[PDB]
Amino acid sequence: TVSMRDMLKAGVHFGHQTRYWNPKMKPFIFGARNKVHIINLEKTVPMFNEALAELNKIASRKGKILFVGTKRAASEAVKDAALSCDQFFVNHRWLGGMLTNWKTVRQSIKRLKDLETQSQDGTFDKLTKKEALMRTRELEKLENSLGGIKDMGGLPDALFVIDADHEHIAIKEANNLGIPVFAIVDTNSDPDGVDFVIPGNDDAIRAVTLYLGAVAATVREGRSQDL
Amino acid sequence: ATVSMRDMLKAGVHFGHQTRYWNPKMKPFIFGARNKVHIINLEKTVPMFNEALAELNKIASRKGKILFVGTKRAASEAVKDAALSCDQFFVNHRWLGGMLTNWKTVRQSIKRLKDLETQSQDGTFDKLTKKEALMRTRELEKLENSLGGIKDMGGLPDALFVIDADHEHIAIKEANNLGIPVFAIVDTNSDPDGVDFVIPGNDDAIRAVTLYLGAVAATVREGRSQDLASQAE
Amino acid sequence: TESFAQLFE
Ligand SMILES: [Zn+2]
């Protein structure tokens, strides 16, 4: 649904410096200027529109989307977006084995939720003896990343990644299990395993919010049409 | 940057002042006298304006600092928006006397100004007094009025774009004393000898003024395009 | 007022 005027304002067309660039992305690039690659927005939209259609398709069957935004800048931005659509998110390091090694992480979430209530209720308090400090600090560490998926979400049906390099670890585990992935690939990221691809600036705060907006919109819309 | 020889005609660039207040040096740009006024020669006007546009465009490409000067209240508002839109800062109403030369002394002023702004969300809550509070707010207002819009520069600007020139003869004098090139919308009563790019327009009606502002604004965006990226999509 | 072009002609 996004328009060219939308992106052109945000700066989605802006791509990483010349030196850093994977020649595999040349099709999605128009003409480099001032030692900086300029994405060919003319191609971006047609694929972004197709991808939004696909995301609507998923949410129809009430599938579980997961948003990945390790990048400190967009990290908080991804948090907010995932709330409006009530989909899962991960704004910190994509803990290895997040999907592939499900048994271990599932037990971990069990531990987390149990610790959560106990301290929340107050049990932790009576114990004190620095042991209360330990269990509160453990919650913090776990929540810093594990948080966002605590409510089950086993083997989602799609992953939305802001960057197509930094989170290569995520863009791999999903390929092993055959879970489709989406990514706002820039000019320095490998266009591999991304399946539905989306050439887009993944650095500017402005542009990331744009993407988050549109994707969150379609996801809730799909839920409503099934409803 | 080739404003139609007819757009300015409707703007009001043709209407100068009367003979009683007419700079005799401006003769090269005269067409006659409508009701004893002095109708600027637009045909003579236009090459110079378009040439300066290109000149100012290559400047912004070399990343040379630009500047604009506030005039009448209406002019000042218009100048502000066009400047803020892109960059190149802007004056407002007084030019703060000898800004150039005394740029080091006004630099200390800019320093104090910014500190107060920062301390306007700090010092205000703590130790506030029914006396000191009014002091802080009022002084900031005065400082901002003129100094605001220049504080950003953090250095000596490399160009200047004034209006009318006559109303700011002081500004041109300082600019001539440093080599910094300038542009002025000279009118029928303005000494243009000090200007390096005589724009024989009319600082009046605002309408036409808005045209000049819009024009240059566009040229400095071309400079930013060379500083950012080329036109594409 | 008459157009400048016509006046100059
Ligand atoms: Zn005048």
Short mmCIF file of C-alpha atoms and ligand atoms in Angstrom, two decimals:
data_model
loop_
_atom_site.label_atom_id
_atom_site.label_comp_id
_atom_site.label_asym_id
_atom_site.label_seq_id
_atom_site.Cartn_x
_atom_site.Cartn_y
_atom_site.Cartn_z
CA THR A 1 0.00 0.00 0.00
CA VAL A 2 3.04 2.22 0.48
CA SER A 3 3.76 4.91 -2.11
CA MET A 4 6.96 6.15 -3.71
CA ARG A 5 6.48 9.53 -2.02
CA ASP A 6 6.36 7.67 1.30
CA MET A 7 9.77 6.02 0.88
CA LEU A 8 11.44 8.95 -0.91
CA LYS A 9 10.81 11.00 2.24
CA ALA A 10 12.12 8.39 4.68
CA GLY A 11 15.25 7.73 2.63
CA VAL A 12 14.75 4.00 1.96
CA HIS A 13 16.65 4.57 -1.29
CA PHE A 14 19.83 5.30 0.68
CA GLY A 15 22.32 2.44 0.60
CA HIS A 16 25.60 1.65 2.32
CA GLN A 17 28.89 3.13 1.10
CA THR A 18 30.36 1.89 -2.18
CA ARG A 19 33.18 -0.25 -0.71
CA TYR A 20 30.79 -2.36 1.40
CA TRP A 21 28.41 -4.00 -1.08
CA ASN A 22 27.58 -7.52 -2.23
CA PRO A 23 27.63 -7.53 -6.07
CA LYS A 24 24.75 -10.02 -5.84
CA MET A 25 22.43 -7.06 -5.12
CA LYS A 26 23.26 -5.08 -8.28
CA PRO A 27 19.77 -5.70 -9.83
CA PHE A 28 18.06 -4.04 -6.85
CA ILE A 29 20.45 -1.07 -7.25
CA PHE A 30 19.94 1.79 -9.70
CA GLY A 31 22.88 4.12 -10.17
CA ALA A 32 25.57 4.64 -7.56
CA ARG A 33 26.39 8.29 -6.91
CA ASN A 34 28.79 10.11 -4.59
CA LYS A 35 30.46 6.85 -3.53
CA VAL A 36 27.08 5.65 -2.24
CA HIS A 37 24.71 3.12 -3.79
CA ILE A 38 21.18 4.34 -4.51
CA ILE A 39 18.52 1.63 -4.32
CA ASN A 40 16.24 1.41 -7.36
CA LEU A 41 13.02 2.25 -5.53
CA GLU A 42 11.13 1.47 -8.76
CA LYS A 43 11.77 -2.21 -7.98
CA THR A 44 11.36 -1.94 -4.20
CA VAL A 45 7.62 -1.15 -4.12
CA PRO A 46 6.45 -3.94 -6.50
CA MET A 47 8.12 -6.52 -4.25
CA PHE A 48 7.18 -4.78 -0.99
CA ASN A 49 3.55 -4.78 -2.14
CA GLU A 50 3.73 -8.50 -2.96
CA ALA A 51 5.28 -9.17 0.46
CA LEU A 52 2.51 -7.30 2.26
CA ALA A 53 0.02 -9.47 0.38
CA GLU A 54 1.88 -12.56 1.61
CA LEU A 55 1.85 -11.30 5.21
CA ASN A 56 -1.90 -10.77 4.95
CA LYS A 57 -2.25 -14.33 3.65
CA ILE A 58 -0.39 -15.70 6.68
CA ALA A 59 -2.35 -13.80 9.34
CA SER A 60 -5.52 -15.22 7.74
CA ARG A 61 -4.74 -18.69 9.14
CA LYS A 62 -3.74 -16.97 12.41
CA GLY A 63 -0.08 -17.74 11.88
CA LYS A 64 2.60 -16.40 14.20
CA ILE A 65 4.91 -13.72 12.79
CA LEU A 66 8.18 -12.94 14.57
CA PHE A 67 10.01 -9.62 14.24
CA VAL A 68 13.80 -9.48 14.59
CA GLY A 69 15.56 -6.19 15.25
CA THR A 70 18.87 -6.60 17.08
CA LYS A 71 20.13 -3.19 15.86
CA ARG A 72 20.16 -0.95 18.94
CA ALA A 73 18.55 1.95 17.05
CA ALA A 74 15.55 0.06 15.64
CA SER A 75 15.42 -2.33 18.62
CA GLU A 76 13.03 -0.18 20.65
CA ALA A 77 11.16 0.68 17.45
CA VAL A 78 10.53 -3.01 16.74
CA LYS A 79 9.23 -3.51 20.29
CA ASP A 80 6.53 -0.87 19.87
CA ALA A 81 5.42 -2.13 16.46
CA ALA A 82 5.04 -5.75 17.58
CA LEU A 83 2.67 -4.63 20.35
CA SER A 84 0.01 -3.12 18.08
CA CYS A 85 -0.20 -6.35 16.08
CA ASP A 86 0.43 -8.58 19.14
CA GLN A 87 3.07 -10.54 17.21
CA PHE A 88 6.30 -11.82 18.71
CA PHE A 89 9.51 -9.78 18.68
CA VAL A 90 13.19 -10.02 19.59
CA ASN A 91 15.04 -6.70 19.97
CA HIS A 92 18.32 -8.20 21.26
CA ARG A 93 20.84 -10.87 20.27
CA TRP A 94 19.22 -13.74 18.38
CA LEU A 95 20.28 -16.39 20.90
CA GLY A 96 21.80 -19.26 18.95
CA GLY A 97 19.50 -22.22 18.46
CA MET A 98 16.48 -19.92 18.95
CA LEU A 99 14.51 -22.20 16.60
CA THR A 100 16.67 -25.22 15.63
CA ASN A 101 17.41 -25.96 19.30
CA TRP A 102 13.83 -25.62 20.46
CA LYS A 103 13.78 -28.15 23.30
CA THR A 104 16.40 -26.27 25.32
CA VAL A 105 14.93 -22.80 24.80
CA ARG A 106 11.45 -24.12 25.60
CA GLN A 107 12.64 -25.39 28.98
CA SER A 108 14.27 -21.97 29.42
CA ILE A 109 10.96 -20.18 28.88
CA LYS A 110 9.39 -22.53 31.43
CA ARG A 111 12.05 -21.53 33.96
CA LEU A 112 11.46 -17.86 33.10
CA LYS A 113 7.67 -17.79 33.55
CA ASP A 114 8.00 -19.64 36.86
CA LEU A 115 10.59 -17.16 38.14
CA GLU A 116 8.39 -14.31 36.83
CA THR A 117 5.33 -15.09 38.98
CA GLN A 118 7.24 -15.98 42.18
CA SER A 119 9.06 -12.64 42.29
CA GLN A 120 6.03 -10.72 41.00
CA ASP A 121 3.89 -12.24 43.77
CA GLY A 122 6.52 -11.52 46.42
CA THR A 123 7.87 -14.94 47.39
CA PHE A 124 11.34 -13.69 46.38
CA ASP A 125 11.11 -10.91 49.00
CA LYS A 126 10.81 -13.13 52.10
CA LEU A 127 13.85 -15.10 50.93
CA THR A 128 16.17 -12.07 50.59
CA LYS A 129 19.72 -13.07 51.62
CA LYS A 130 21.06 -11.79 48.27
CA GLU A 131 19.25 -14.77 46.75
CA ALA A 132 16.36 -12.43 45.95
CA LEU A 133 18.82 -10.22 44.07
CA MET A 134 19.99 -13.23 42.06
CA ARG A 135 16.51 -14.27 40.94
CA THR A 136 15.49 -10.72 40.00
CA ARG A 137 18.67 -10.16 37.99
CA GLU A 138 18.17 -13.49 36.23
CA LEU A 139 14.68 -12.41 35.14
CA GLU A 140 16.14 -9.19 33.72
CA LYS A 141 18.76 -11.00 31.64
CA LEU A 142 16.26 -13.54 30.31
CA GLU A 143 13.64 -10.90 29.52
CA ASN A 144 16.22 -8.74 27.72
CA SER A 145 16.04 -11.23 24.84
CA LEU A 146 13.76 -14.19 25.61
CA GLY A 147 11.04 -11.62 26.31
CA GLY A 148 8.64 -11.09 23.42
CA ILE A 149 8.13 -14.79 22.65
CA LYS A 150 7.36 -16.01 26.22
CA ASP A 151 3.77 -16.73 25.13
CA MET A 152 4.60 -19.93 23.23
CA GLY A 153 5.05 -19.18 19.55
CA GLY A 154 6.70 -22.51 18.74
CA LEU A 155 8.06 -22.70 15.17
CA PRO A 156 6.52 -19.52 13.69
CA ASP A 157 5.35 -19.34 10.09
CA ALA A 158 7.51 -16.32 9.12
CA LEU A 159 10.39 -14.10 10.24
CA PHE A 160 10.64 -10.37 9.50
CA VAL A 161 14.24 -9.17 9.79
CA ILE A 162 15.39 -5.56 9.53
CA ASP A 163 18.89 -6.43 8.25
CA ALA A 164 19.95 -9.28 5.98
CA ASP A 165 23.52 -9.60 7.29
CA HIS A 166 23.74 -8.80 11.01
CA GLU A 167 21.07 -11.44 11.71
CA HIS A 168 22.52 -14.05 9.34
CA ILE A 169 22.22 -16.55 12.20
CA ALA A 170 18.43 -16.18 12.15
CA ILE A 171 18.18 -16.14 8.33
CA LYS A 172 19.80 -19.59 8.48
CA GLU A 173 17.98 -21.61 11.18
CA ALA A 174 14.74 -20.70 9.41
CA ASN A 175 16.04 -22.01 6.08
CA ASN A 176 16.93 -25.30 7.76
CA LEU A 177 13.34 -25.71 8.98
CA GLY A 178 11.75 -24.27 5.82
CA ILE A 179 10.14 -21.26 7.53
CA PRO A 180 9.72 -18.38 5.04
CA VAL A 181 11.65 -15.22 5.88
CA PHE A 182 11.46 -11.54 4.94
CA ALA A 183 14.17 -8.91 5.20
CA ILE A 184 14.78 -5.24 4.47
CA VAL A 185 18.01 -6.11 2.65
CA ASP A 186 20.37 -3.19 2.04
CA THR A 187 23.23 -3.07 -0.48
CA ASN A 188 25.82 -4.73 1.79
CA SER A 189 23.76 -7.85 2.63
CA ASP A 190 23.64 -11.20 0.86
CA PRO A 191 20.35 -11.77 -1.05
CA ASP A 192 20.37 -15.46 -0.09
CA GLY A 193 17.75 -17.50 1.73
CA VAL A 194 15.70 -14.30 2.12
CA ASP A 195 12.96 -15.79 -0.13
CA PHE A 196 10.56 -12.83 -0.55
CA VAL A 197 13.12 -10.02 -0.62
CA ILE A 198 12.78 -6.27 -0.04
CA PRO A 199 15.64 -3.91 -1.01
CA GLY A 200 15.51 -1.25 1.69
CA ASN A 201 17.69 0.99 3.84
CA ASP A 202 17.99 -0.77 7.21
CA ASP A 203 19.88 1.97 9.08
CA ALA A 204 17.84 5.21 9.20
CA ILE A 205 15.37 5.44 12.08
CA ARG A 206 12.92 7.05 9.66
CA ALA A 207 12.87 4.17 7.17
CA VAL A 208 12.62 1.34 9.72
CA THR A 209 9.50 2.89 11.26
CA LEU A 210 7.95 3.07 7.78
CA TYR A 211 8.45 -0.67 7.26
CA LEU A 212 7.20 -1.46 10.77
CA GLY A 213 4.06 0.59 10.18
CA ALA A 214 3.04 -1.12 6.95
CA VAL A 215 3.82 -4.65 8.17
CA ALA A 216 1.99 -4.18 11.47
CA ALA A 217 -0.97 -2.75 9.54
CA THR A 218 -1.38 -5.72 7.19
CA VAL A 219 -0.95 -8.26 10.01
CA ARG A 220 -3.82 -6.91 12.11
CA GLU A 221 -5.93 -6.45 8.97
CA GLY A 222 -5.52 -10.14 8.15
CA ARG A 223 -6.57 -11.15 11.66
CA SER A 224 -9.66 -8.96 11.31
CA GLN A 225 -10.73 -10.40 7.94
CA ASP A 226 -10.65 -13.93 9.37
CA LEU A 227 -12.40 -12.73 12.55
CA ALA B 1 16.44 28.32 -12.08
CA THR B 2 15.13 30.15 -15.17
CA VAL B 3 12.11 32.01 -13.75
CA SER B 4 9.80 32.96 -16.62
CA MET B 5 10.29 36.56 -17.79
CA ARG B 6 6.52 36.80 -17.21
CA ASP B 7 6.15 35.33 -13.71
CA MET B 8 8.15 38.18 -12.20
CA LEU B 9 6.08 40.62 -14.28
CA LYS B 10 2.98 39.67 -12.29
CA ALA B 11 5.02 39.39 -9.08
CA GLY B 12 5.76 43.12 -8.91
CA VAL B 13 9.46 43.27 -9.73
CA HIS B 14 8.78 46.03 -12.26
CA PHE B 15 7.54 48.63 -9.73
CA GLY B 16 10.32 50.57 -8.02
CA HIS B 17 10.11 53.71 -5.93
CA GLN B 18 9.78 57.30 -7.16
CA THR B 19 12.42 59.67 -8.51
CA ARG B 20 12.59 61.56 -5.20
CA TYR B 21 14.31 58.43 -3.80
CA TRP B 22 16.24 56.95 -6.74
CA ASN B 23 19.90 55.91 -6.70
CA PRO B 24 21.37 57.56 -9.83
CA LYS B 25 23.86 54.69 -10.17
CA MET B 26 21.05 52.29 -11.10
CA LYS B 27 20.63 53.86 -14.58
CA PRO B 28 21.82 50.67 -16.44
CA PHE B 29 18.56 49.02 -15.28
CA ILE B 30 15.81 51.48 -16.22
CA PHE B 31 12.95 51.22 -18.71
CA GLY B 32 11.11 54.53 -18.17
CA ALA B 33 8.74 56.05 -15.63
CA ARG B 34 5.18 54.83 -15.04
CA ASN B 35 3.42 57.60 -13.07
CA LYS B 36 6.88 59.07 -12.31
CA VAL B 37 7.97 55.76 -10.71
CA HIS B 38 10.95 53.86 -12.20
CA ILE B 39 10.20 50.58 -13.98
CA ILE B 40 13.21 48.28 -13.73
CA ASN B 41 14.29 46.76 -17.05
CA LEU B 42 13.37 43.10 -16.62
CA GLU B 43 15.22 42.07 -19.80
CA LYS B 44 18.33 43.58 -18.22
CA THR B 45 17.44 42.01 -14.86
CA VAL B 46 17.00 38.38 -15.82
CA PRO B 47 20.47 37.22 -17.08
CA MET B 48 22.11 38.48 -13.88
CA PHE B 49 19.60 36.71 -11.64
CA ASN B 50 19.88 33.38 -13.46
CA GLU B 51 23.67 33.73 -13.50
CA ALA B 52 23.79 34.31 -9.73
CA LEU B 53 21.53 31.29 -9.27
CA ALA B 54 24.14 29.13 -11.00
CA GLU B 55 26.92 30.86 -9.04
CA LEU B 56 25.11 30.19 -5.76
CA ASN B 57 24.51 26.60 -6.87
CA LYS B 58 28.20 25.83 -7.46
CA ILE B 59 28.86 27.37 -4.04
CA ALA B 60 26.57 24.93 -2.22
CA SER B 61 28.31 22.18 -4.21
CA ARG B 62 31.71 23.18 -2.79
CA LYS B 63 29.83 23.19 0.56
CA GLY B 64 30.36 26.91 1.14
CA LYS B 65 28.23 28.30 3.96
CA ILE B 66 25.32 30.45 2.77
CA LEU B 67 23.39 33.06 4.75
CA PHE B 68 20.26 35.19 4.49
CA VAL B 69 19.33 38.47 6.18
CA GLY B 70 16.05 39.44 7.79
CA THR B 71 14.33 42.63 6.68
CA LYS B 72 10.77 43.90 7.27
CA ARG B 73 8.63 41.73 9.54
CA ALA B 74 6.91 40.03 6.60
CA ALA B 75 10.22 39.55 4.79
CA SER B 76 11.82 38.12 7.94
CA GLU B 77 9.18 35.42 8.38
CA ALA B 78 9.43 34.41 4.72
CA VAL B 79 13.24 34.30 4.83
CA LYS B 80 13.20 32.15 7.98
CA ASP B 81 11.00 29.38 6.56
CA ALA B 82 12.92 29.10 3.28
CA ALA B 83 16.24 28.94 5.14
CA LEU B 84 15.12 26.47 7.82
CA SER B 85 13.61 24.32 5.05
CA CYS B 86 17.09 23.49 3.78
CA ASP B 87 20.03 24.99 5.72
CA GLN B 88 22.29 28.03 5.26
CA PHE B 89 21.02 29.63 8.51
CA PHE B 90 19.40 33.11 8.53
CA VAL B 91 19.42 36.52 10.23
CA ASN B 92 16.13 38.04 11.42
CA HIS B 93 15.85 41.78 11.98
CA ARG B 94 18.88 43.59 13.40
CA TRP B 95 22.00 41.77 12.06
CA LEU B 96 23.50 42.24 15.57
CA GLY B 97 25.78 45.10 14.50
CA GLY B 98 29.33 44.03 13.74
CA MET B 99 28.62 40.28 13.66
CA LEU B 100 31.46 39.81 11.18
CA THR B 101 34.82 40.75 12.78
CA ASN B 102 33.24 40.66 16.25
CA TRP B 103 32.36 37.07 15.32
CA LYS B 104 34.69 35.81 18.04
CA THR B 105 33.04 38.01 20.67
CA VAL B 106 29.54 37.03 19.52
CA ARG B 107 30.80 33.44 19.56
CA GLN B 108 31.03 33.66 23.34
CA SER B 109 27.49 35.04 23.20
CA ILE B 110 26.33 32.03 21.18
CA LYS B 111 28.01 29.76 23.74
CA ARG B 112 26.16 31.38 26.64
CA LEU B 113 22.92 31.28 24.64
CA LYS B 114 23.06 27.52 24.00
CA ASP B 115 24.00 26.80 27.62
CA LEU B 116 20.93 28.72 28.78
CA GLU B 117 18.73 26.74 26.39
CA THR B 118 20.19 23.53 27.81
CA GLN B 119 19.81 24.88 31.35
CA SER B 120 16.27 25.98 30.48
CA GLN B 121 15.12 22.40 31.12
CA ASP B 122 17.50 22.03 34.09
CA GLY B 123 18.06 25.20 36.12
CA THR B 124 14.38 26.13 35.81
CA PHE B 125 13.02 23.37 38.04
CA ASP B 126 15.66 23.63 40.79
CA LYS B 127 16.33 26.86 42.73
CA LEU B 128 13.56 28.66 40.80
CA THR B 129 12.69 32.06 42.25
CA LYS B 130 9.83 34.41 41.38
CA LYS B 131 12.64 36.80 40.31
CA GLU B 132 15.32 34.68 38.63
CA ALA B 133 12.79 32.80 36.49
CA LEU B 134 11.66 35.95 34.68
CA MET B 135 15.31 36.92 34.16
CA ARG B 136 16.15 33.60 32.45
CA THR B 137 13.11 33.47 30.16
CA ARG B 138 13.27 37.12 29.05
CA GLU B 139 17.00 37.15 28.26
CA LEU B 140 16.69 33.95 26.21
CA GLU B 141 13.85 35.50 24.19
CA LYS B 142 15.91 38.58 23.31
CA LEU B 143 19.03 36.56 22.48
CA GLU B 144 16.99 34.12 20.37
CA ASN B 145 15.18 36.82 18.31
CA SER B 146 18.37 37.78 16.45
CA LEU B 147 21.16 35.39 17.51
CA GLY B 148 18.86 32.44 16.86
CA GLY B 149 19.20 31.20 13.32
CA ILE B 150 22.96 31.88 13.32
CA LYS B 151 23.99 29.89 16.42
CA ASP B 152 24.29 26.77 14.24
CA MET B 153 27.10 28.13 11.99
CA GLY B 154 29.85 27.44 14.52
CA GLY B 155 32.19 29.37 12.26
CA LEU B 156 32.64 32.04 9.63
CA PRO B 157 30.12 31.85 6.76
CA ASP B 158 31.42 31.73 3.20
CA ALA B 159 28.57 33.61 1.49
CA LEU B 160 25.73 36.03 2.19
CA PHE B 161 22.36 36.69 0.54
CA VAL B 162 20.83 39.95 1.80
CA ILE B 163 17.69 41.74 0.53
CA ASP B 164 17.34 45.35 -0.72
CA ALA B 165 20.94 45.93 0.49
CA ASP B 166 20.17 49.55 1.40
CA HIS B 167 18.41 48.53 4.64
CA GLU B 168 21.55 46.54 5.53
CA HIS B 169 24.41 48.70 4.13
CA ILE B 170 26.14 47.78 7.40
CA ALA B 171 26.12 44.08 6.48
CA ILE B 172 27.71 44.72 3.08
CA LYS B 173 30.51 46.80 4.61
CA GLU B 174 31.64 43.98 6.89
CA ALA B 175 31.37 41.41 4.09
CA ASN B 176 33.56 43.55 1.83
CA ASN B 177 36.14 43.70 4.63
CA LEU B 178 36.68 39.92 4.56
CA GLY B 179 36.27 38.78 0.93
CA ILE B 180 33.07 36.80 1.67
CA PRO B 181 30.96 37.07 -1.51
CA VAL B 182 27.42 38.42 -1.32
CA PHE B 183 24.20 38.75 -3.29
CA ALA B 184 21.63 41.52 -2.91
CA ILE B 185 18.20 42.25 -4.35
CA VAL B 186 19.16 45.85 -5.13
CA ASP B 187 16.29 48.26 -5.81
CA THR B 188 16.07 51.73 -7.37
CA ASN B 189 17.59 53.22 -4.18
CA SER B 190 20.51 50.97 -3.22
CA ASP B 191 24.26 51.41 -3.77
CA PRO B 192 25.25 48.20 -5.60
CA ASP B 193 28.98 48.89 -6.02
CA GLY B 194 29.79 46.73 -2.99
CA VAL B 195 27.76 43.79 -4.30
CA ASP B 196 29.41 41.06 -6.38
CA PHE B 197 26.12 39.84 -7.93
CA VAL B 198 23.66 42.67 -8.57
CA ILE B 199 20.09 41.33 -8.52
CA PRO B 200 18.11 44.39 -9.67
CA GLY B 201 14.76 43.25 -8.25
CA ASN B 202 12.34 44.96 -5.86
CA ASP B 203 12.28 44.33 -2.09
CA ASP B 204 8.54 44.98 -1.82
CA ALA B 205 5.09 43.36 -1.94
CA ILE B 206 6.65 40.19 -0.44
CA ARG B 207 5.10 38.29 -3.37
CA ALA B 208 8.08 39.09 -5.59
CA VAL B 209 10.38 38.68 -2.57
CA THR B 210 8.93 35.19 -2.07
CA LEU B 211 9.87 34.52 -5.71
CA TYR B 212 13.54 35.31 -5.11
CA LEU B 213 13.55 33.24 -1.91
CA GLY B 214 11.89 30.32 -3.67
CA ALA B 215 14.37 30.57 -6.55
CA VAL B 216 17.59 30.51 -4.51
CA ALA B 217 16.10 27.85 -2.20
CA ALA B 218 15.81 25.64 -5.27
CA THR B 219 19.41 26.29 -6.36
CA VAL B 220 20.81 25.37 -2.95
CA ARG B 221 18.88 22.09 -3.11
CA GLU B 222 20.75 21.31 -6.32
CA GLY B 223 23.91 21.90 -4.32
CA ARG B 224 22.64 19.46 -1.71
CA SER B 225 21.79 16.97 -4.46
CA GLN B 226 25.45 17.03 -5.47
CA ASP B 227 26.19 16.67 -1.74
CA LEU B 228 23.71 13.81 -1.25
CA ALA B 229 22.67 11.89 -4.38
CA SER B 230 21.44 12.43 -7.93
CA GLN B 231 17.83 12.56 -9.06
CA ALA B 232 16.39 9.06 -9.51
CA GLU B 233 13.75 6.64 -8.22
CA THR C 1 -1.72 47.10 -16.58
CA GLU C 2 -0.60 46.25 -20.12
CA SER C 3 1.87 43.39 -20.50
CA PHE C 4 5.55 44.33 -20.61
CA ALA C 5 6.02 42.37 -23.84
CA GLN C 6 3.34 44.37 -25.67
CA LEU C 7 4.60 47.62 -24.13
CA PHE C 8 8.19 46.91 -25.20
CA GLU C 9 6.99 45.99 -28.71
ZN ZN D 1 11.89 49.08 -1.86
#
